[PDB]
Structures are given as C-alpha cells and as structure tokens.
Coordinates of N, CA, C and O in Angstrom, one line a residue:
Chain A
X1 N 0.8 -1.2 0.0 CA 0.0 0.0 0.0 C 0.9 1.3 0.0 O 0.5 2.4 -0.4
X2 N 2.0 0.8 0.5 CA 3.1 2.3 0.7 C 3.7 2.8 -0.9 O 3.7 3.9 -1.4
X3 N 4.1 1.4 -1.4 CA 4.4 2.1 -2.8 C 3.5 2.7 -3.5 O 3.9 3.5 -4.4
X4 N 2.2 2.5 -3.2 CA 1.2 2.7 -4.6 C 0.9 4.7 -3.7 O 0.7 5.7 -4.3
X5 N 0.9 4.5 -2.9 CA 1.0 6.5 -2.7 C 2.4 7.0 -2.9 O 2.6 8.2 -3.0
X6 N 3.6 6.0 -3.2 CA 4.7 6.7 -3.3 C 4.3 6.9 -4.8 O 4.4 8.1 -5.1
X7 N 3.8 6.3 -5.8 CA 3.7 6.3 -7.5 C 2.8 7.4 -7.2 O 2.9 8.5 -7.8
X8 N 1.6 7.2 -6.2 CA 1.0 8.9 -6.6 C 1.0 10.0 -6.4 O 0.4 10.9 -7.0
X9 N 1.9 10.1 -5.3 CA 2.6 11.2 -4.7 C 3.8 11.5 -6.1 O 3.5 12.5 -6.7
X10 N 4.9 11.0 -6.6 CA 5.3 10.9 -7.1 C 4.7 11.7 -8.8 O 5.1 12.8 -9.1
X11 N 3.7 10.9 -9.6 CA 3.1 10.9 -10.0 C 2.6 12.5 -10.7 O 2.6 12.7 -11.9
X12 N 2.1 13.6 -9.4 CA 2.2 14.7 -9.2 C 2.7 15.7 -10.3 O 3.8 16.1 -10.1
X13 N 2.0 16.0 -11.5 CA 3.1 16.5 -12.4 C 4.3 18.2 -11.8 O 4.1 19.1 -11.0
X14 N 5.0 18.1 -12.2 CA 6.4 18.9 -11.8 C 6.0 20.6 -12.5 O 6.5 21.0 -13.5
X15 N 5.2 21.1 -11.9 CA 4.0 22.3 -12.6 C 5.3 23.3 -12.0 O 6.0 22.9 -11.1
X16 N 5.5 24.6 -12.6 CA 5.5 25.5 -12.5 C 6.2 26.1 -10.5 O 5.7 25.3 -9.6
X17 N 6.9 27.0 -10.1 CA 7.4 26.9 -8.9 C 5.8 27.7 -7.9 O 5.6 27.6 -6.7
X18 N 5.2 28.3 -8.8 CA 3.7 28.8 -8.3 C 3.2 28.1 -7.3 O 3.1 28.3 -6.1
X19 N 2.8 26.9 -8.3 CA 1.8 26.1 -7.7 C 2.3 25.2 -6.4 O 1.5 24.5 -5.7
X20 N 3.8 25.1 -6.1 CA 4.2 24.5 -4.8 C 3.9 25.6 -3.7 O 3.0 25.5 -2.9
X21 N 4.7 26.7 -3.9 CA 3.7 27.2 -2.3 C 2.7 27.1 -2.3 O 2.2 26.5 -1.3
X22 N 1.4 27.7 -3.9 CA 0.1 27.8 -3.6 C -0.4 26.9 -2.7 O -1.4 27.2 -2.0
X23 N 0.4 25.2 -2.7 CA 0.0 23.8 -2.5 C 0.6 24.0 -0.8 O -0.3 23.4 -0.1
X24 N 1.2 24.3 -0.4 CA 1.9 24.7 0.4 C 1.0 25.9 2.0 O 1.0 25.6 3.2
X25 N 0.5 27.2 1.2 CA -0.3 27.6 1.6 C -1.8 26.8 1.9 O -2.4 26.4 2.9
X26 N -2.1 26.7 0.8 CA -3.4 25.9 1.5 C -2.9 24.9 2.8 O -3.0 25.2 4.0
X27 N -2.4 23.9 2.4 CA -1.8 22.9 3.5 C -1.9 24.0 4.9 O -2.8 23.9 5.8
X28 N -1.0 24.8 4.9 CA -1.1 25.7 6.1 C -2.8 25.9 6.5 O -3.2 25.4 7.5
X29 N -3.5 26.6 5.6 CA -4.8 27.4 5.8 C -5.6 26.2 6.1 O -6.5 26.3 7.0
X30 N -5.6 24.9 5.5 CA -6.3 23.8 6.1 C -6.1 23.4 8.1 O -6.9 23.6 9.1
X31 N -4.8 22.9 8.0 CA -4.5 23.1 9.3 C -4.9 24.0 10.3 O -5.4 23.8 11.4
X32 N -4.6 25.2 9.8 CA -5.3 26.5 10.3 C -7.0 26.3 10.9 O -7.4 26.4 12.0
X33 N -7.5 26.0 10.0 CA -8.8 25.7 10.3 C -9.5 24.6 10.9 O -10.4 24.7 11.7
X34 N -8.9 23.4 10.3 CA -8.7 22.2 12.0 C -8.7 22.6 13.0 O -9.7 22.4 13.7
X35 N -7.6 23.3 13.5 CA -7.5 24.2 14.5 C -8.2 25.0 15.2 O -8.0 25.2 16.3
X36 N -9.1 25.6 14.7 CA -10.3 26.6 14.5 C -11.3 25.7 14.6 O -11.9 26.2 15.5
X37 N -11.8 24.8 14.4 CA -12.6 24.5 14.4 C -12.8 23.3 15.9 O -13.8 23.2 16.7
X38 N -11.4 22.6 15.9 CA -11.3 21.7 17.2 C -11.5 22.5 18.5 O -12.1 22.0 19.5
X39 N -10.9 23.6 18.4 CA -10.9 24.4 19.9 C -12.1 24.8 20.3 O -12.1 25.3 21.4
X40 N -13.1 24.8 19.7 CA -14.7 24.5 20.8 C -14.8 23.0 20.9 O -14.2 22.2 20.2
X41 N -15.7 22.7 21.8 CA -16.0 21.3 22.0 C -17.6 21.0 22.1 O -18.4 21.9 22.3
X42 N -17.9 19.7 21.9 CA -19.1 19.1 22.5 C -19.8 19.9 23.5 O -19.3 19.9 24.7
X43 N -21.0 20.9 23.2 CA -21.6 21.4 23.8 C -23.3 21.6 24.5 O -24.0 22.5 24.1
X44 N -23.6 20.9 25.1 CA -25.5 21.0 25.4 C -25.6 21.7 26.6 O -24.7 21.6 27.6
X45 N -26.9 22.4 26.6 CA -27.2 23.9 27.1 C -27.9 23.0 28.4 O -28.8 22.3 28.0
X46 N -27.8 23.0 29.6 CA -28.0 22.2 30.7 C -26.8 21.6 31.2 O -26.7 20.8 32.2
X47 N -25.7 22.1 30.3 CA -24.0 21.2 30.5 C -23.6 22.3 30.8 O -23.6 22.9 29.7
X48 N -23.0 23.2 31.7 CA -21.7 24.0 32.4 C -20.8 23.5 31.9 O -19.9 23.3 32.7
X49 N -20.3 23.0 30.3 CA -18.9 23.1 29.8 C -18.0 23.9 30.4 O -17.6 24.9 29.8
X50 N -17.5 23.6 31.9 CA -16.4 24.3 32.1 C -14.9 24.1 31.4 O -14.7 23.3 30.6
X51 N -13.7 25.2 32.1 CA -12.7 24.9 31.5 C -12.0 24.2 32.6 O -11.7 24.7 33.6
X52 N -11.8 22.6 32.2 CA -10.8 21.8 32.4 C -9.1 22.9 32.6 O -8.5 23.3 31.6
X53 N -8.6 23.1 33.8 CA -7.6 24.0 33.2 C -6.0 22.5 33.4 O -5.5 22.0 34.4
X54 N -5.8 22.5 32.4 CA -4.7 21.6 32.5 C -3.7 21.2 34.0 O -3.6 20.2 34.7
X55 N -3.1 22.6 33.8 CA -2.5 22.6 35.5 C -3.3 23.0 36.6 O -3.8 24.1 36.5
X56 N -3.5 22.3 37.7 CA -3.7 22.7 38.9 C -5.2 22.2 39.0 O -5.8 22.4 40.1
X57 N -5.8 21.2 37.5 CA -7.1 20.8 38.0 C -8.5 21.7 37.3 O -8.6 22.6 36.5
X58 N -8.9 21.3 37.8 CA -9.8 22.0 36.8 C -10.2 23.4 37.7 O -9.8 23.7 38.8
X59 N -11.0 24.0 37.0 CA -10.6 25.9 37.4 C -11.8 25.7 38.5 O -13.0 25.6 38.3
X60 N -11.2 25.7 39.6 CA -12.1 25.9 41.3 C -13.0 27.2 40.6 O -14.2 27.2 40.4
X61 N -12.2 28.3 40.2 CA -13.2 29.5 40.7 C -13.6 30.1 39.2 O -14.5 31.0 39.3
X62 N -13.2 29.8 37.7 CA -13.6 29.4 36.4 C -15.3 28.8 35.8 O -15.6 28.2 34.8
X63 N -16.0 29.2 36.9 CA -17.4 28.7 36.8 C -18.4 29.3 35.6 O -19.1 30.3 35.6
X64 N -17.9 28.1 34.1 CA -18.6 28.8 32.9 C -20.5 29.1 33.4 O -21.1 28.1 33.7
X65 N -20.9 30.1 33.5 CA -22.5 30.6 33.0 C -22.4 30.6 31.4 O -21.5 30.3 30.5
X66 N -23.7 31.1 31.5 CA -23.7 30.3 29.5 C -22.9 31.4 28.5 O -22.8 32.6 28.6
X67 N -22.5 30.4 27.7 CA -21.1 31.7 27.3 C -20.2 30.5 26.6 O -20.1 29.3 26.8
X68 N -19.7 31.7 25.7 CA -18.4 30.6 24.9 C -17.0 30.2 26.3 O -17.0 30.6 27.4
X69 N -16.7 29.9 26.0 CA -15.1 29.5 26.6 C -14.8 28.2 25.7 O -15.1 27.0 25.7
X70 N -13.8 29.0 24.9 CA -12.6 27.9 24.2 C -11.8 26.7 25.1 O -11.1 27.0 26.2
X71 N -11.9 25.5 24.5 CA -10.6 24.9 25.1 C -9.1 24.6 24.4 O -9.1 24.2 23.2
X72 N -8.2 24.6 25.0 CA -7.1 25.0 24.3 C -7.1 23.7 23.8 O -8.0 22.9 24.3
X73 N -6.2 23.1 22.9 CA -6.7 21.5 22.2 C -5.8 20.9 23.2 O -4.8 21.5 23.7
X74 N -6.2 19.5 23.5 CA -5.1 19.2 24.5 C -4.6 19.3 25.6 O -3.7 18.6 26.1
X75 N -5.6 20.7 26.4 CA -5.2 21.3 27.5 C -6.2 21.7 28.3 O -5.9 22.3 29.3
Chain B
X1 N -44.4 27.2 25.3 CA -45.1 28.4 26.1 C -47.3 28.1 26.1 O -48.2 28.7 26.6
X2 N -47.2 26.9 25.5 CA -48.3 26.9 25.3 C -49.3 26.3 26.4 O -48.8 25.2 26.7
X3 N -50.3 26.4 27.0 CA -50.8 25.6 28.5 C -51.1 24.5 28.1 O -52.3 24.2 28.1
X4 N -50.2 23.7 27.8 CA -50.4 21.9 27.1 C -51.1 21.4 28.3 O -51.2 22.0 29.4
X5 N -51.4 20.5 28.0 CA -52.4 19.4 29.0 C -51.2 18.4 29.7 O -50.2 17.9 29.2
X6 N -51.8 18.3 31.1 CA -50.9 17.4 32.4 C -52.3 17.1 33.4 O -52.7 17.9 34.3
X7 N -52.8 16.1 33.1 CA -53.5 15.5 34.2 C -52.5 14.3 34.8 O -51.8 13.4 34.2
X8 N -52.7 14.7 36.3 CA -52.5 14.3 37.1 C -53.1 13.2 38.3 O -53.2 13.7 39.4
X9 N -53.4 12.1 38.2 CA -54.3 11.4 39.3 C -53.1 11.3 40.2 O -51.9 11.4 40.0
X10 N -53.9 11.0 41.6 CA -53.6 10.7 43.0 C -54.5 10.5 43.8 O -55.7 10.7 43.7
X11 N -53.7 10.0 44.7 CA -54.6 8.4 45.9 C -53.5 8.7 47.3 O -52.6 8.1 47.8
X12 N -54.6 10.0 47.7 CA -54.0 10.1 48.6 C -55.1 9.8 50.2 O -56.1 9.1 50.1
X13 N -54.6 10.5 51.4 CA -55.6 10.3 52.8 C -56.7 11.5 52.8 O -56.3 12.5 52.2
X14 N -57.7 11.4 53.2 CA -58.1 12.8 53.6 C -57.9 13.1 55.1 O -57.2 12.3 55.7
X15 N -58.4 13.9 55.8 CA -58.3 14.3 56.6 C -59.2 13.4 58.0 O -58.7 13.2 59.1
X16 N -60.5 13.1 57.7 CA -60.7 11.9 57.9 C -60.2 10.2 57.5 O -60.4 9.0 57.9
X17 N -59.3 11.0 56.5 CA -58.2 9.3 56.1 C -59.6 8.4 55.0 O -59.2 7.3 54.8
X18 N -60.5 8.6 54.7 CA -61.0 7.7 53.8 C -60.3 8.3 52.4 O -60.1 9.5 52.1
X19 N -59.9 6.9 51.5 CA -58.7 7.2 50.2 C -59.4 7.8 49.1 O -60.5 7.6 48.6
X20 N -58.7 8.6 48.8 CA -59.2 9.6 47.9 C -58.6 9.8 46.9 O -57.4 10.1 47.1
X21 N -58.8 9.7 46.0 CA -58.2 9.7 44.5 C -58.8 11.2 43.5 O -59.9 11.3 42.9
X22 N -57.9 11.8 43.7 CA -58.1 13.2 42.9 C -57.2 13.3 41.6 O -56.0 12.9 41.9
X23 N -57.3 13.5 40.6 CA -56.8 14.1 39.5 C -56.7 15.8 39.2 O -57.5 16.6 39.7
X24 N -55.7 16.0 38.4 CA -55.8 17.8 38.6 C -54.8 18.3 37.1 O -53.9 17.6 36.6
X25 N -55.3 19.4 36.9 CA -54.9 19.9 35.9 C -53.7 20.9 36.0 O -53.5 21.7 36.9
X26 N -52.7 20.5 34.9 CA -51.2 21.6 35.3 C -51.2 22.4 34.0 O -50.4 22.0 33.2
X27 N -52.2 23.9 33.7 CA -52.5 24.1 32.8 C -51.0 25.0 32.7 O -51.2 26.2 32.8
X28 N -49.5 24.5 32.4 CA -48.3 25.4 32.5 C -48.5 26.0 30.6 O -48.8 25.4 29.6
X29 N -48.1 27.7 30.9 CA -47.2 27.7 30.0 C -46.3 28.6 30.2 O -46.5 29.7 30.6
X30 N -45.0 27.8 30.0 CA -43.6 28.3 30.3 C -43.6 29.8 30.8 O -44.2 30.5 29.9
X31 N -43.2 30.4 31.5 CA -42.8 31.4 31.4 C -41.8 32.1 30.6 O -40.6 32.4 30.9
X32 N -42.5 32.1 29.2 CA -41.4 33.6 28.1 C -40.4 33.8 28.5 O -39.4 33.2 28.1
X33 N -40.3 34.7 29.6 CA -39.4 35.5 30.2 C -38.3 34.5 30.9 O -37.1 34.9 31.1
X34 N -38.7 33.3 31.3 CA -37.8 32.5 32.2 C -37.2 31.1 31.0 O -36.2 30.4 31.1
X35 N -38.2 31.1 30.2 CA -37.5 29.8 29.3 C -35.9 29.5 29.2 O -35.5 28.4 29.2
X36 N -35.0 30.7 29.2 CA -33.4 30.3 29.5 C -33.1 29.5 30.2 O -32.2 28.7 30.1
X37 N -34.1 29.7 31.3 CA -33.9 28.9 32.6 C -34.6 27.4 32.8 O -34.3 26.4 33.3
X38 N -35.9 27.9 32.0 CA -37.1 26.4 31.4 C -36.2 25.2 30.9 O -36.5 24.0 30.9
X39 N -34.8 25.9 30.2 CA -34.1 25.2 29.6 C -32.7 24.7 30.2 O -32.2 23.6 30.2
X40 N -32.3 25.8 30.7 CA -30.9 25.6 31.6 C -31.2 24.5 32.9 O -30.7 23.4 32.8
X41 N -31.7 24.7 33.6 CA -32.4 24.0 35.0 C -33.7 23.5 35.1 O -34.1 23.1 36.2
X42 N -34.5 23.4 33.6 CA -35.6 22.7 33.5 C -35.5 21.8 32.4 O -36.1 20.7 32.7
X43 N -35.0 21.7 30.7 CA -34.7 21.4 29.8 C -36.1 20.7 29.2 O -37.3 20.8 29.6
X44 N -35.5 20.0 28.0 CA -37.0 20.3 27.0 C -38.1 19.5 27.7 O -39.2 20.1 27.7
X45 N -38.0 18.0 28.3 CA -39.1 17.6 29.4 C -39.7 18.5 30.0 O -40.6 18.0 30.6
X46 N -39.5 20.4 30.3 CA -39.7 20.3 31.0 C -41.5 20.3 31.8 O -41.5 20.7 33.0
X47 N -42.4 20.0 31.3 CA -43.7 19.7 32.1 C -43.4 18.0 32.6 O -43.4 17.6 33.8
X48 N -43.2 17.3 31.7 CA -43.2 16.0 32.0 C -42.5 15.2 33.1 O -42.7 14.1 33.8
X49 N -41.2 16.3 33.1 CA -40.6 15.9 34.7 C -40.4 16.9 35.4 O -39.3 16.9 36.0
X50 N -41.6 18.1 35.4 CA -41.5 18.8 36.5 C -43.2 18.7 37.5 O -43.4 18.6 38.7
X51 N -44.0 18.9 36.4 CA -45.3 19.1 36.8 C -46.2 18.0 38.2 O -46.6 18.2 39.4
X52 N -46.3 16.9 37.2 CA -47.0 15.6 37.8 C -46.8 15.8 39.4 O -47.7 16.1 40.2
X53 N -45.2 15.6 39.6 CA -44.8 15.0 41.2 C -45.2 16.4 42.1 O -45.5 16.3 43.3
X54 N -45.3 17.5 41.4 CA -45.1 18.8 42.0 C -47.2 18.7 42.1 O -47.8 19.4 42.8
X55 N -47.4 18.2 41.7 CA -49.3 18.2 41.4 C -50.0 17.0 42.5 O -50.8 17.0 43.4
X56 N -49.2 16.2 42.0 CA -49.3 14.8 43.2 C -49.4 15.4 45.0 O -50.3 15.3 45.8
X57 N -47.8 16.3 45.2 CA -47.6 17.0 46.6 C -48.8 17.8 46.7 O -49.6 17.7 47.7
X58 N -49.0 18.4 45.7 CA -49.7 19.9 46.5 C -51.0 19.0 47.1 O -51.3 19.0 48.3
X59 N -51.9 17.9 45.6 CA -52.5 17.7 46.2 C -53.4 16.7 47.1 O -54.6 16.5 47.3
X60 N -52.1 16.0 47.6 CA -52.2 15.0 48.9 C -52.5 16.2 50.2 O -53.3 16.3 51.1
X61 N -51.4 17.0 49.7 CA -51.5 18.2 51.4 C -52.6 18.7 51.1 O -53.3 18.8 52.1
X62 N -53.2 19.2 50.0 CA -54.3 20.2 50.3 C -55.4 18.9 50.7 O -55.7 19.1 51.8
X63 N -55.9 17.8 50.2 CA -56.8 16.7 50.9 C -56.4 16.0 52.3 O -57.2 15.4 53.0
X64 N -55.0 16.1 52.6 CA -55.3 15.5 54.2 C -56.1 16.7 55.2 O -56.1 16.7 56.4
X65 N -56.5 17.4 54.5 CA -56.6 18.7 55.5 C -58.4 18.9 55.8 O -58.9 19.6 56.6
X66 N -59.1 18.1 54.7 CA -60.4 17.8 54.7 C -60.6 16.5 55.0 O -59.7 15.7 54.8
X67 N -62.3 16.1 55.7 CA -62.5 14.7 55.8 C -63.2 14.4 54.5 O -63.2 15.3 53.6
X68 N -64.1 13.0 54.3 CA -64.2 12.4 52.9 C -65.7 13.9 52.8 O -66.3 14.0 51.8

C-alpha cells in the first residue's frame, strides 16, 4: 500500500514553482482551520462546559455561566 | 409556552383518612421570560418531569386537611 502512494505522490506532475507554495499555503490554511474548528468542544445547554484547566485541575473559581469558553486542544 | 395538558391522578388520605383519588390539571405555559432557565435547570421535558410529582404533593396536602 506504501508504494502505490509513493507512485501517486510521485506521480504529481512537476508544474511551474507557483503552484508548490500555492499547494503549500493551502496545507497551512487547512490546518489553520482544524485548528479553528477543534478548539470548541461538545456542547449542550444544561451542560456548564467548564474549563478543564490543565494545570492545577480544573478551574475551582472558572465557573462557565452560559457563554463561549474555548478549550485550548489538549489542555 | 403553550398551557399543554398534564393530568394528574392521586390516591392520597383525607383528613378523615378515607382514600381519595383526585386528578388535577397543570395548565403550564412556560414562562417567556424565564424559558433560558425552562431550559438551563428545566430542559425540554420540562412539564413531563416537572409538573406531575409537584401536582401529586400539593394535592395530597391540600386533601389530608379535609375529611371524605
């Protein structure tokens, strides 16, 4: 299975030096928005989604009322 | 928000204690102004698991207080 993405990765015609950042940028702006999109979470309205704070436990005095609060990904 | 229908039976004492079985009407509609709350600390059940047991209490107490 590994060769057959190396032939299509490969494969890729050798276009112009444009289209490598353009390909390059997106890649970024995709990730970008993963990003963007992962850092809210699973949310229902009867649920105090609080913020879990990584260190120290979860936030004693951090008591979400209804309201955004991001969580950092991971943390 | 609308006064949906909630009948309630109960079999409760009267005051003379002969069993008494009353039914009662919980003609709710939400309060507009409070539904944030209808929904935060009441959520979308909310007549179905708030009304009944709250209809049941009042009215066992309001009949132990008369005889049959």
């Amino acid at each position: 299975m590994a060769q057959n993405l190396k032939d299509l990765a490969g494969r890729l015609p050798a276009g112009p030096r444009g289209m490598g950042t353009a390909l390059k940028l997106l890649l970024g702006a995709g990730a970008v928005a993963y990003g963007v999109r992962e850092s809210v979470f699973t949310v229902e309205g009867g649920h105090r989604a609080i913020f879990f704070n990584r260190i120290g436990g979860v936030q004693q005095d951090t008591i979400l009322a209804e309201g955004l609060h991001f969580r950092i990904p991971w943390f | 928000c609308r006064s949906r229908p909630r009948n309630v039976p109960v079999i409760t004492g009267s005051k003379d204690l002969q069993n008494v079985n009353i039914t009662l009407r919980i003609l709710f509609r939400p309060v507009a102004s409070q539904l944030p709350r209808i929904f935060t600390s009441i959520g979308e059940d909310y007549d179905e698991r708030v009304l009944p047991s709250i209809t049941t209490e009042i009215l066992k107490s309001v009949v132990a207080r008369f005889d049959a």
